[PDB]
From Swiss-Prot:
Protein name as it appears in the record: Fibroblast growth factor 1
One Pfam family here: FGF
Span(s) of short sequence motif Nuclear localization signal: 12-15
Keywords, in A-Z order: Acetylation, Angiogenesis, Cytoplasm, Developmental protein, Differentiation, Growth factor, Heparin-binding, Mitogen, Nucleus, Phosphoprotein, Secreted
GO molecular function terms listed in the Swiss-Prot or TrEMBL record: fibroblast growth factor receptor binding; growth factor activity; heparin binding; integrin binding; S100 protein binding
Tissues expressing the protein: Predominantly expressed in kidney and brain. Detected at much lower levels in heart and skeletal muscle.
Record's comment on post-translational modification: In the nucleus, phosphorylated by PKC/PRKCD.
Organism field: Homo sapiens
PANTHER family in UniProt: FIBROBLAST GROWTH FACTOR (PTHR11486)
Compartments reported by the entry: Secreted; Cytoplasm; Cytoplasm, Cell cortex; Cytoplasm, Cytosol
Effect of residue 121 to A: Loss of LRRC59-binding
Effect ascribed to mutating residue 38 to E: Dominant-negative mutant. Defective in integrin-binding and in ternary complex formation with integrin and FGFR1. No effect on heparin- and FGFR1-binding. Defective in inducing FGF1 signaling, cell proliferation and cell migration
Length: 140
């Protein structure tokens, strides 16, 4: 129940998910915490995306093997194993950026998003039109 404009590019190589908002890269820490950092030398910002179905992806830390996931209350966390909370609908936005909508909570438009201060947005606080939800996958 969402548009199907997909971004180009593939999932062959890992990427850094750069957030246009504050300029932070999405980060999945060893303890399961998820946030953003501007430090390009960080070892937990390298992410491998994989397509599960057309337009659906898993976003995994290449350093720890953890899956990006959004919980029942909209909080991003790092999961040790893949589950329905780890699937995201990857879509093009503003004819340029990549956005990631929680498949599980797609009806409520809960996006992956980073605030200018580097902390993740909670699902319910995200919405189309915010810069917090706009990402650019950059080469590692």
């Amino acid at each position: 129940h969402h548009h199907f404009n997909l971004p180009p590019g593939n999932y062959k190589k890992p990427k850094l998910l750069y957030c246009s908002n504050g300029g932070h890269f999405l980060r999945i820490l060893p303890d399961g915490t998820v946030d953003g950092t501007r430090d390009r030398s960080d070892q937990h910002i390298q992410l491998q995306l994989s397509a599960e179905s057309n337009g659906e992806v898993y976003i995994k830390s290449t350093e720890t093997g953890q899956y990006l996931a959004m919980d029942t209350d909209g909080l991003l966390y790092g999961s040790q194993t893949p589950n329905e909370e780890c699937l995201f609908l990857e879509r093009l936005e503003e004819n340029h950026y990549n956005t990631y909508i929680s498949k599980k909570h797609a009806e409520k438009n809960w996006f992956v998003g980073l605030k200018k201060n580097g902390s993740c947005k909670r699902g319910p606080r995200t919405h189309y039109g915010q810069k917090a939800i706009l990402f650019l996958p950059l080469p590692v």
